[PDB]
Design an enzyme around this catalytic site. Structure first.
Site, PDB file in Angstrom:
ATOM      1  N   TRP A  78       0.819  -0.955   0.100  1.00 39.03           N
ATOM      2  CA  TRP A  78       0.012  -0.004  -0.033  1.00 39.03           C
ATOM      3  C   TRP A  78       0.793   1.230  -0.033  1.00 39.03           C
ATOM      4  O   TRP A  78       0.573   2.308  -0.712  1.00 39.03           O
ATOM      5  CB  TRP A  78      -1.024   0.056   1.139  1.00 39.03           C
ATOM      6  CG  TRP A  78      -1.601   1.208   1.357  1.00 39.03           C
ATOM      7  CD1 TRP A  78      -1.382   2.258   2.405  1.00 39.03           C
ATOM      8  CD2 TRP A  78      -2.788   1.700   0.802  1.00 39.03           C
ATOM      9  NE1 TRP A  78      -2.167   3.177   2.441  1.00 39.03           N
ATOM     10  CE2 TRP A  78      -3.218   2.831   1.140  1.00 39.03           C
ATOM     11  CE3 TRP A  78      -3.564   1.041  -0.255  1.00 39.03           C
ATOM     12  CZ2 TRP A  78      -4.319   3.807   0.901  1.00 39.03           C
ATOM     13  CZ3 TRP A  78      -4.787   1.948  -1.012  1.00 39.03           C
ATOM     14  CH2 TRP A  78      -5.015   3.254  -0.117  1.00 39.03           C
ATOM     15  N   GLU A 119      -0.351  -1.908  -5.679  1.00 42.52           N
ATOM     16  CA  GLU A 119      -1.509  -1.379  -5.238  1.00 42.52           C
ATOM     17  C   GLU A 119      -1.934   0.096  -5.683  1.00 42.52           C
ATOM     18  O   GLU A 119      -1.420   1.099  -5.076  1.00 42.52           O
ATOM     19  CB  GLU A 119      -1.794  -1.372  -3.707  1.00 42.52           C
ATOM     20  CG  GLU A 119      -1.517  -2.759  -3.199  1.00 42.52           C
ATOM     21  CD  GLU A 119      -1.826  -2.902  -1.648  1.00 42.52           C
ATOM     22  OE1 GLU A 119      -2.569  -2.037  -1.066  1.00 42.52           O
ATOM     23  OE2 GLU A 119      -1.599  -4.207  -1.194  1.00 42.52           O
ATOM     24  N   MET A 189      -7.175 -10.115  -1.298  1.00 44.84           N
ATOM     25  CA  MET A 189      -7.329  -9.261  -0.061  1.00 44.84           C
ATOM     26  C   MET A 189      -8.705  -8.936   0.462  1.00 44.84           C
ATOM     27  O   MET A 189      -9.062  -7.626   0.019  1.00 44.84           O
ATOM     28  CB  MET A 189      -6.355  -7.924  -0.336  1.00 44.84           C
ATOM     29  CG  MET A 189      -4.833  -8.301  -0.618  1.00 44.84           C
ATOM     30  SD  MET A 189      -3.666  -6.896  -0.615  1.00 44.84           S
ATOM     31  CE  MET A 189      -4.035  -6.270  -2.229  1.00 44.84           C
ATOM     32  N   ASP A 192     -10.447  -4.865   4.641  1.00 41.51           N
ATOM     33  CA  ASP A 192     -10.525  -3.201   4.657  1.00 41.51           C
ATOM     34  C   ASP A 192     -11.628  -3.142   3.667  1.00 41.51           C
ATOM     35  O   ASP A 192     -11.547  -2.098   2.960  1.00 41.51           O
ATOM     36  CB  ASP A 192      -9.188  -2.992   3.718  1.00 41.51           C
ATOM     37  CG  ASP A 192      -7.720  -3.385   4.232  1.00 41.51           C
ATOM     38  OD1 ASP A 192      -7.809  -3.298   5.712  1.00 41.51           O
ATOM     39  OD2 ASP A 192      -6.703  -3.738   3.829  1.00 41.51           O
TER      40      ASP A 192
HETATM   41  C1  LIG Z   1      -8.107   5.462   6.689  1.00 43.43           C
HETATM   42  C2  LIG Z   1      -7.505   5.958   5.460  1.00 43.43           C
HETATM   43  O1  LIG Z   1      -7.802   6.922   5.028  1.00 43.43           O
HETATM   44  N1  LIG Z   1      -6.267   5.526   4.952  1.00 43.43           N
HETATM   45  C3  LIG Z   1      -5.641   4.214   5.532  1.00 43.43           C
HETATM   46  C4  LIG Z   1      -5.775   3.126   4.838  1.00 43.43           C
HETATM   47  O2  LIG Z   1      -7.014   2.773   4.144  1.00 43.43           O
HETATM   48  C5  LIG Z   1      -7.088   2.321   3.054  1.00 43.43           C
HETATM   49  C6  LIG Z   1      -6.684   0.791   2.870  1.00 43.43           C
HETATM   50  O3  LIG Z   1      -6.979  -0.016   3.969  1.00 43.43           O
HETATM   51  C7  LIG Z   1      -6.736   0.205   1.668  1.00 43.43           C
HETATM   52  N2  LIG Z   1      -6.128  -1.203   1.685  1.00 43.43           N
HETATM   53  C8  LIG Z   1      -5.547  -1.941   0.630  1.00 43.43           C
HETATM   54  C9  LIG Z   1      -4.973  -3.232   0.592  1.00 43.43           C
HETATM   55  O4  LIG Z   1      -5.658  -1.218  -0.573  1.00 43.43           O
HETATM   56  C10 LIG Z   1      -8.374   0.165   1.636  1.00 43.43           C
HETATM   57  O5  LIG Z   1      -8.640  -0.365   0.205  1.00 43.43           O
HETATM   58  C11 LIG Z   1      -9.814  -1.459   0.105  1.00 43.43           C
HETATM   59  C12 LIG Z   1     -11.081  -0.385   0.284  1.00 43.43           C
HETATM   60  O6  LIG Z   1     -12.414  -1.227   0.484  1.00 43.43           O
HETATM   61  C13 LIG Z   1     -11.114   0.082  -1.193  1.00 43.43           C
HETATM   62  N3  LIG Z   1     -10.383   1.340  -1.438  1.00 43.43           N
HETATM   63  C14 LIG Z   1      -9.411   1.239  -2.282  1.00 43.43           C
HETATM   64  N4  LIG Z   1      -8.659   2.060  -2.540  1.00 43.43           N
HETATM   65  C15 LIG Z   1      -7.323   1.618  -3.513  1.00 43.43           C
HETATM   66  C16 LIG Z   1      -8.594   3.410  -1.979  1.00 43.43           C
HETATM   67  O7  LIG Z   1      -9.388  -0.205  -2.604  1.00 43.43           O
HETATM   68  C17 LIG Z   1     -10.467  -1.049  -2.158  1.00 43.43           C
HETATM   69  C18 LIG Z   1      -9.931  -2.064  -1.253  1.00 43.43           C
HETATM   70  C19 LIG Z   1     -10.625  -3.263  -0.991  1.00 43.43           C
HETATM   71  O8  LIG Z   1     -10.591  -3.831  -2.446  1.00 43.43           O
HETATM   72  O9  LIG Z   1      -8.828   1.427   1.705  1.00 43.43           O
HETATM   73  C20 LIG Z   1      -8.752   2.097   2.776  1.00 43.43           C
HETATM   74  C21 LIG Z   1      -9.337   3.425   2.603  1.00 43.43           C
HETATM   75  O10 LIG Z   1      -8.876   4.068   1.436  1.00 43.43           O
HETATM   76  O11 LIG Z   1      -4.939   1.875   5.263  1.00 43.43           O
HETATM   77  C22 LIG Z   1      -3.632   2.140   5.485  1.00 43.43           C
HETATM   78  C23 LIG Z   1      -2.982   0.772   6.106  1.00 43.43           C
HETATM   79  O12 LIG Z   1      -3.590   0.425   7.097  1.00 43.43           O
HETATM   80  C24 LIG Z   1      -3.751   3.304   6.593  1.00 43.43           C
HETATM   81  O13 LIG Z   1      -2.143   3.499   7.174  1.00 43.43           O
HETATM   82  C25 LIG Z   1      -4.390   4.594   6.257  1.00 43.43           C
HETATM   83  O14 LIG Z   1      -3.802   5.233   5.204  1.00 43.43           O
HETATM   84  C1  LIG Z   2       7.058  -0.644   4.992  1.00 44.16           C
HETATM   85  C2  LIG Z   2       6.071   0.471   5.527  1.00 44.16           C
HETATM   86  O1  LIG Z   2       5.532   1.274   4.798  1.00 44.16           O
HETATM   87  N1  LIG Z   2       5.868   0.460   6.862  1.00 44.16           N
HETATM   88  C3  LIG Z   2       4.820   1.250   7.530  1.00 44.16           C
HETATM   89  C4  LIG Z   2       3.399   0.357   7.808  1.00 44.16           C
HETATM   90  O2  LIG Z   2       2.822   0.357   6.694  1.00 44.16           O
HETATM   91  C5  LIG Z   2       2.114  -0.772   6.463  1.00 44.16           C
HETATM   92  C6  LIG Z   2       0.689  -1.176   7.353  1.00 44.16           C
HETATM   93  O3  LIG Z   2      -0.200   0.299   7.143  1.00 44.16           O
HETATM   94  C7  LIG Z   2      -0.105  -2.267   6.968  1.00 44.16           C
HETATM   95  N2  LIG Z   2      -1.549  -2.180   7.598  1.00 44.16           N
HETATM   96  C8  LIG Z   2      -2.069  -3.168   8.302  1.00 44.16           C
HETATM   97  C9  LIG Z   2      -3.483  -2.858   8.775  1.00 44.16           C
HETATM   98  O4  LIG Z   2      -1.459  -4.229   8.600  1.00 44.16           O
HETATM   99  C10 LIG Z   2      -0.156  -2.404   5.422  1.00 44.16           C
HETATM  100  O5  LIG Z   2      -0.846  -3.704   4.912  1.00 44.16           O
HETATM  101  C11 LIG Z   2      -1.423  -3.862   3.938  1.00 44.16           C
HETATM  102  C12 LIG Z   2      -0.454  -4.209   2.744  1.00 44.16           C
HETATM  103  O6  LIG Z   2       0.430  -2.996   2.523  1.00 44.16           O
HETATM  104  C13 LIG Z   2      -1.283  -4.703   1.768  1.00 44.16           C
HETATM  105  N3  LIG Z   2      -0.467  -5.878   1.097  1.00 44.16           N
HETATM  106  C14 LIG Z   2      -1.414  -7.052   1.547  1.00 44.16           C
HETATM  107  N4  LIG Z   2      -0.701  -8.214   0.972  1.00 44.16           N
HETATM  108  C15 LIG Z   2      -1.464  -9.508   1.652  1.00 44.16           C
HETATM  109  C16 LIG Z   2       0.373  -8.234   0.049  1.00 44.16           C
HETATM  110  O7  LIG Z   2      -2.157  -7.055   2.350  1.00 44.16           O
HETATM  111  C17 LIG Z   2      -2.309  -5.336   2.716  1.00 44.16           C
HETATM  112  C18 LIG Z   2      -2.308  -4.981   3.973  1.00 44.16           C
HETATM  113  C19 LIG Z   2      -3.636  -4.901   4.794  1.00 44.16           C
HETATM  114  O8  LIG Z   2      -4.347  -3.879   4.003  1.00 44.16           O
HETATM  115  O9  LIG Z   2       1.001  -2.191   4.827  1.00 44.16           O
HETATM  116  C20 LIG Z   2       1.616  -1.028   4.898  1.00 44.16           C
HETATM  117  C21 LIG Z   2       2.927  -1.025   3.999  1.00 44.16           C
HETATM  118  O10 LIG Z   2       2.523  -1.084   2.819  1.00 44.16           O
HETATM  119  O11 LIG Z   2       2.567   0.958   8.892  1.00 44.16           O
HETATM  120  C22 LIG Z   2       3.082   1.258  10.033  1.00 44.16           C
HETATM  121  C23 LIG Z   2       1.899   2.006  10.832  1.00 44.16           C
HETATM  122  O12 LIG Z   2       1.243   2.925  10.041  1.00 44.16           O
HETATM  123  C24 LIG Z   2       4.244   2.143   9.815  1.00 44.16           C
HETATM  124  O13 LIG Z   2       4.802   2.423  11.321  1.00 44.16           O
HETATM  125  C25 LIG Z   2       5.444   1.508   8.975  1.00 44.16           C
HETATM  126  O14 LIG Z   2       5.824   0.259   9.720  1.00 44.16           O
END
Ligand SMILES: CC(=O)N[C@H]1[C@H](O[C@H]2[C@@H](O)[C@@H](NC(C)=O)[C@H](O[C@H]3[C@H](O)[C@H]4N=C(N(C)C)O[C@H]4[C@@H]3CO)O[C@@H]2CO)O[C@H](CO)[C@@H](O)[C@H]1O
Ligand SMILES: CC(=O)N[C@H]1[C@H](O[C@H]2[C@@H](O)[C@@H](NC(C)=O)[C@H](O[C@H]3[C@H](O)[C@H]4N=C(N(C)C)O[C@H]4[C@@H]3CO)O[C@@H]2CO)O[C@H](CO)[C@@H](O)[C@H]1O
Ligand SMILES: [Zn+2]
Ligand SMILES: [Zn+2]
Ligand SMILES: [Zn+2]
Length: 364
Positions: A78, A119, A189, A192
């Site tokens: 992400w 992504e 996935m 979320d």
């Molecule tokens: C809360 C916020 O504004 N940002 C969060 C961020 O929220 C994201 C991610 O959780 C997305 N996760 C992934 C794997 O893309 C999540 O995507 C979901 C959502 O239902 C739909 N929105 C998208 N986007 C590309 C925006 O794709 C789908 C997918 C489901 O198929 O969307 C939420 C809200 O935008 O999550 C990160 C990591 O926890 C957090 O740091 C913060 O930036």
């Molecule tokens: C390397 C980095 O940027 N580290 C960040 C860390 O970013 C994480 C988290 O926001 C993850 N969120 C959660 C709920 O675990 C996020 O998980 C995403 C991941 O990117 C997507 N890819 C998958 N796969 C199955 C391949 O699943 C999703 C998950 C779940 O939505 O990943 C981002 C990094 O991309 O965030 C922490 C806290 O903000 C920060 O300290 C730092 O370590």
């Protein structure tokens, strides 16, 4: 059946017992272990942490205890964005450089494959043409991996991809039928679905829609995501159902209105270990003593609340339900994000080590 589990290389920086290193991994727990995340530099696969070279050796070294285990390295995520992928897949020379670097990098550290976590193509700033360029990248990698196994005499490198559940994102970046033919497996996935970016509470990973949902919102659940990928061309045996070992939290507008769909004022308080407001690890949810647990009947998943805090998460029961679901659908297995968010040392939940993922191993 496959049980694909993700390791994250930033978990090693959490405080106290939450700190997670390769030594916290159980080599027998999963069938495939995927290392998140590698990055990209000059169109080549690269490390992201100071000790990745040592962690890679420790991670892949787990195969000395369990030779049946397959390991993959995931690129992207992400926070990685899309620019580097768009740029890399845009020319034959860049794709060639990336593919050749992937083979050399994976062989050097003893990884068995590559997991693509772009992504996402066609969104998040990536042009609509990337839908087709993503297909070309998958084909190039599959072809190069196939030929390299033949010239080297080694086991063929695997290729998987983590893909979105949202109908809008699937349609925008994936020629599902085409990529499914060249990917060894697809890590869906299916989570979320709802989160603190909304003004109402909603479960991170509901199995089914709420009776109250319709239209586009009716597709924000595991079942809808699965049907979409299958109907669009993914063989059931290649579709791996992703499940979260984390939940998404909210601060309620009122401690008196605690239902799913109740008004919310923002993210829930950050976890003491994960420190990302809006999410909590399963082991952080376990520490909520005095909280009230509820089951969303339509969606087959739980949520808990205490005062003005509300969190939708997955537990042993919902994981059992989802495995029962995926078996009935004939899916290839389960995927889990992430190992370091389960109670990996059995400290918080008093349910033994890896209560959620062990449940997957046993049920599958
Ligand atoms: C809360 C916020 O504004 N940002 C969060 C961020 O929220 C994201 C991610 O959780 C997305 N996760 C992934 C794997 O893309 C999540 O995507 C979901 C959502 O239902 C739909 N929105 C998208 N986007 C590309 C925006 O794709 C789908 C997918 C489901 O198929 O969307 C939420 C809200 O935008 O999550 C990160 C990591 O926890 C957090 O740091 C913060 O930036
Ligand atoms: C390397 C980095 O940027 N580290 C960040 C860390 O970013 C994480 C988290 O926001 C993850 N969120 C959660 C709920 O675990 C996020 O998980 C995403 C991941 O990117 C997507 N890819 C998958 N796969 C199955 C391949 O699943 C999703 C998950 C779940 O939505 O990943 C981002 C990094 O991309 O965030 C922490 C806290 O903000 C920060 O300290 C730092 O370590
Ligand atoms: Zn330790
Ligand atoms: Zn470039
Ligand atoms: Zn929602």
């Amino acid at each position: 059946a496959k049980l694909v589990c993700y390791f994250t290389n930033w978990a090693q920086y959490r405080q106290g017992e939450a700190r997670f290193l390769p030594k916290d991994l159980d080599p027998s727990l999963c069938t495939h272990l995927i290392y998140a995340f590698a990055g990209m530099t000059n169109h080549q696969l690269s490390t992201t942490e100071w000790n990745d070279e040592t962690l890679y050796q420790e991670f892949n070294g787990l195969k000395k205890m369990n030779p049946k285990l397959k390991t993959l390295l995931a690129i992207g995520g992400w926070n990685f964005g899309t620019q580097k992928f768009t740029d890399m897949v845009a020319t034959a020379n860049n794709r060639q450089t990336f593919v050749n670097s992937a083979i050399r990098f994976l062989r050097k550290y003893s990884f068995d494959g590559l997991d693509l976590d772009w992504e996402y193509p066609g969104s998040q700033g990536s042009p609509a043409v990337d839908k087709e360029r993503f297909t070309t990248l998958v084909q190039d990698l599959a072809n190069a991996f196939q030929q390299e196994a033949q010239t080297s005499g080694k086991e063929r490198l695997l290729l998987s991809a983590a893909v979105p559940a949202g109908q809008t994102y699937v349609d925008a970046g994936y020629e599902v039928d085409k990529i499914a033919q060249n990917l060894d497996f697809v890590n869906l996935m299916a989570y979320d679905f709802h989160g603190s970016w909304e003004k109402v509470t909603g479960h991170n990973s509901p199995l089914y829609k709420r009776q109250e949902q319709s239209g586009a919102a009716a597709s924000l659940n595991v079942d809808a995501a699965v049907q979409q990928w299958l109907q669009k061309g993914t063989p059931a045996s290649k579709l791996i159902l992703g499940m979260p070992t984390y939940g998404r939290s909210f601060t309620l507008a009122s401690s008196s209105d605690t239902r799913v769909g109740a008004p919310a004022t923002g993210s829930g308080t950050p976890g003491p270990f994960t420190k990302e407001g809006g999410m909590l690890a399963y082991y952080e949810v376990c520490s909520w003593k005095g909280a009230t647990k509820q089951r969303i009947q339509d969606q087959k998943v739980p949520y808990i609340f205490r005062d003005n805090q509300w969190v939708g998460f997955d537990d042993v029961e919902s994981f059992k339900t989802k495995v029962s679901y995926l078996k009935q659908k004939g899916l290839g297995g389960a995927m889990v994000w992430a190992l370091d968010l389960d109670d990996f040392a059995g400290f918080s939940c008093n349910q033994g080590r890896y209560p959620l993922i062990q449940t997957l191993r046993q049920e599958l």
